[PDB]
Symmetry: D2
């Protein structure tokens, strides 16, 4: 039987701690939601045997086996993890950039979290501090919209390419720019009032993050409606051009838009969000299906072309990964079929992207064959974390 | 023993006819003419029943590969079913009879062909895949790969930009190598110093390598037609000369002539499909096993195909198809599906934006069907089918 | 004696009837209601035959001008013939029945009127010149003149540009005061500090001066309509607020409301024609003799009318007509012929570019006929006729 | 009789010199072509009397009277002339600018010539040196074209407004830019070969300048075909777009275009050209009709909008006069109904206009009410040279 087979794999009686260290090794976290029952059993008890063991691991056997038979998308997780630490310390040195002077804390924070498509977790630095999604949320509400309404409908209102405000057919160029994000906001969960629409998006972000940290920054929501002249301008221009769905309260939508920009996450929780996008719309730490593959494909496409503001082409060329930056200092990054990530560092460059975060993404792809158009079979001197030795 | 084990798997009882072994091999998708199969095929022709021993004698040579092929470890294992899908898509697009043909081309509006060469050498064609047509702008990715391979990204991009689009961008570089201006600057970096005839032979050599040595030709008829309406290109040429866009000591009128030549290069669906596959395959020609391009050159070529490869229709195309491709005014669409296969679709009648009507139809169809989109998931892909899997 | 000499020139033998003197005066183009003629007309009404003495008693007052008028030293001396030409042009354009009316306006497609006031006070109208319509964008030159007159070119152009055309130019100033953005910034410089009702009264005062005190009104109907579709203007308003385009401590939503108000101001062809003439006349209202505008303000207003006054049609218009003008969505075209006269043409139906169809027709016609083009020659003007001359 | 009346006007016997000084005073030049016979008579002879006088002045009486009865467009010419000298010395101080590094002489040359619509002449500085028209010729060949073919026809090929190369209807924006000047060149005198076309334009420029200096700089013609890559580029682009008239040799037209750019003039002769444009198409020193009023109106219009390159709007706003600058350092300037001018000074500004020349044009209009939209009746503190005291 599997838990016998596995009992031998890990033994030659078993000391409990010695099984925990074995597990964390595979990349998994003790807290893993899919590992609940097993941890519940172990928490009813310090030295297992085939009967005691089988008793606990029974309910989560398929997963535990796949982790211990090194069948995760990244077999040598410990090795891959120390490279990430190298990349982190390397990007730490880069001390350029200005903080959003309108943000107001320390320019000495920096964090990276990884969540594989298999649930494997890693962090370095300030990964547990909450910060604001800002523009990092634009791909998310877009996914939500398409998930609920579908490509066809959603792109009656917004465009699908890069760049003024309005494209050929008088739609905002795409939903990664404010004009387009504002429109997309007006499509989500119509009819109900804003408070309820908001509760709904928060619920959706919760599934996306496997229920890890998602919060809200009223401080930020106030600064946004505060300095939102530019955004109000766009709003009226959109109203005038009849860009919204019938029966829309435009001033209402802007207010909604600002709340969404003030949603909080951490490197860790966000990395899980990113991971769901890596993973076909399935949240990798709960196994729950959150987004239609169609919403995920569309989101990854437009992140690719339009995710790093003015720097999107340079980025697509040298990095080749769907990412999305935001003004609080985040870079949501997705490596399809492998992992999702969240990089956070307050100081931005001219173009509005986290300086350290940009340094990190470049280094990452220069190291491993994660570039969209890297070949998995011949890739020169890069390394492939997906392979054993 | 490896050729024993395989003898047992194909032998049902202690002698195999030669036609039965041949017929089992064909279905795996390989052609008998496969270059990595030459010795084996020689040995066989030099003889009608093999025993464990007379068979060992004919397969030992290319055994690693004969194994992977019979043990269905190819990139598309059930190649026969995948192939019937290609034919359905082909027939589906054969119906779409829109579009106007280029009028500078004197070709049948009812020519239409598709060829596939997988990253492993598996072949399939259907329709007019043997006729030769000119690459035209389809050549742009190829010669850009050649440039970056001989000179390296850094140098080649001192002279040409790397992004979509008044002819020149901010740094007074043409926008990217997939537009005429960019293509003319790239043309000027290849094989510097030596004369045109040689630069040309040199590229043709390189194309032959990429095509695994199948048909690469040349159409003087077209090359003359090109130089007799290259008013817009001469303009570009003079403007670039003025903005100091070429390397030192470039003869611009000569580069323009070299560039008309390259557009006039000929291929067939089948040979082009092999070229596409070399690009799909990290630089190795998949039917010769030979390294042709630095993977750095292949990544770049692909990047720019995805973003500026379909003329004004690139954005729509990248969103809906998500595959690097390049079209040309002759009716050709070079298509690459990274890690899987290369393709070439040829149908002369173009739509409004300069792309083959049928080739375009076919490309959307292909991705509706299989999870080949750049941003499809290999685990969860809803209703699409994965030709890389078994059940 | 001056009033003797003139008595002799109009007296044919030693007593003049009053109706004969009146009838001779009318033909010179003056109206009896002329403000610089008031005392003379009072004296006359206070009385039917004048002798050398009872006439001296009624003309001494405004004698300088009565002289210039009877001695044909006006800017257009044979005013009666010039007037019949205006009517021909009027009738010529009355035939042109193209164009759509603004649908935000509920006016007869068959309303059409033209008024003339020369730099000397000579008046002529024909068609519906008594009906009141809204200035709309026709007000833009006026309030820009007011700005530059109260504040001076240098200041006013710290806030708005001075050239034809993404809303903002290089220096992040609206392009020019004749487009909505420019107009909204200008609106924000006038009468700073005090409240809107007063700023408004203040402008109306200034318009009354410019119109020699003839009809300036206001349409609340329109002002309400304007504020109920000012989505595009509120957008401009927010964008300007963001780019720090206003002076210190401007209330933007209030400026936008003030600006809708100014668009809703009412005039008639006749009163507007006097305004136009003040602009034609270096700033002096030609029927009151009163200075209303610095000539520095008048030159600028005119410069910008010539270059950005006819919406997207300014370049064509300046080439073919060569006269500063401004149109508005109500159907009005403020026209100035420097040193000669001002005009106002009103016909509600607009063409594709936002200009009155008949007003446009009429303006080209006018310059076909007379050498009034900015760049016609006063000596050699081929087949055109000069209304400033005698034979 | 007129020459009696005039004899008294100038006497109370007449010493010949004393009549010459009297004449030059009115603004006229002794060499005046319309004063030929009179000067011929005086040159058959030193102390006239009514018989002797009448004898000489008879043939040119109408003109001489109009000059001596101060009936010229500028009555107080001597006064107006010293202001011009003020303006000249004022602009002389301004020592910025770079010379066309591709031109190659002294950045210390500077000249202004005036020719009134009445023949009155004045110069200061280097007004007798020949320099190249360069772009200053663009309005001239345009006038020629329209004179011979008419507005309707000529604007089938070129535009009439400011700005890439091609406008809405695929015509160059206007003939003051190279693309448009090249087209206009292809319209002039078709059929005949270039040498003959050129002879014809030279003939036309001769009438325009009252037969004053017009020459040709082969040195310049060679530098032009030399560095003409940009121009060749435009040529092919124009060929491709079918912008030329049927049966045109495009490479031929470019060569023609370069010759025209190498035509020489002086401040003095050019000022006469400008004067013909001021004067309705009549050459003011010969009385000859050279250009249709239609060609003159059109030329003045497009000089107004497009004559000073990028600086055309600034210029139109602050100066209000039709002008046209050229890269050798000329500014052809026209004050309609009054005078024509030529300002020359090698050093250019960023935009390509003579620095001193720009200084001069601004000062000129700030002084006198010559601005297009100045009022001749109320004009504040400017002076009106057209009026007596």
């Amino acid at each position: 039987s599997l838990e016998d087979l596995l009992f031998y794999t890990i033994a030659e009686k078993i000391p409990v701690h010695k099984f925990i260290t074995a597990l964390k090794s595979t990349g998994l976290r003790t807290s893993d939601p899919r590992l609940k029952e097993c941890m519940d059993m172990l928490r009813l008890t310090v030295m297992l045997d085939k009967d005691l063991f089988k008793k606990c691991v029974q309910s989560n056997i398929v997963l535990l086996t796949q982790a211990f038979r090194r069948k995760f998308v990244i077999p040598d997780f410990m090795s891959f993890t120390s490279h990430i630490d190298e990349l982190y310390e390397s990007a730490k040195k880069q001390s350029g950039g200005k903080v959003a002077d309108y943000a107001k804390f320390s320019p000495d924070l920096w964090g990276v979290s990884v969540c594989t498509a298999d649930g494997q977790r890693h962090s370095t630095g300030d990964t547990k501090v909450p910060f604001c999604l800002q523009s990092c949320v634009k791909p998310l509400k877009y996914a939500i919209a398409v998930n609920d309404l579908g490509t066809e409908y959603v792109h009656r209102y917004v465009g699908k390419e890069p760049s003024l405000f309005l494209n050929e057919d008088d739609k905002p160029h795409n939903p990664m720019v404010n004009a387009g994000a504002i429109v997309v906001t007006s499509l989500i969960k119509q009819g109900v009032n804003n408070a309820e629409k908001f509760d709904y998006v928060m619920q959706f972000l919760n599934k996306m993050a496997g229920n890890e940290y998602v919060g809200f920054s009223n401080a930020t929501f106030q600064s946004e409606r505060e300095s939102g002249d530019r955004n109000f301008a766009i709003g009226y221009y959109l109203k005038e051009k009849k860009c919204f769905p019938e029966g829309t309260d435009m001033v209402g939508i802007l207010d909604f838009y600002f709340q969404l920009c003030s949603i909080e996450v951490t490197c860790e929780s966000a990395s899980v969000m990113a991971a769901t996008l890596a993973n076909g719309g399935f949240c990798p730490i709960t196994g729950e299906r959150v987004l239609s593959p169609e919403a995920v494909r569309n989101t990854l496409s437009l992140m690719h072309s339009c995710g790093m503001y003015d720097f999107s082409g340079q980025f697509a060329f040298h990095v080749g990964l769907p990412a999305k930056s935001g003004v609080a200092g985040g870079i949501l990054l997705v490596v399809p079929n492998v992992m999702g990530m969240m990089c956070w560092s307050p100081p931005l460059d001219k173009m509005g992207n986290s300086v350290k975060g940009i340094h990190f993404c470049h280094d990452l792809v220069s190291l491993c064959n994660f570039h969209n158009y890297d070949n998995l079979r011949h890739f020169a001197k890069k390394l492939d974390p997906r392979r054993e030795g």
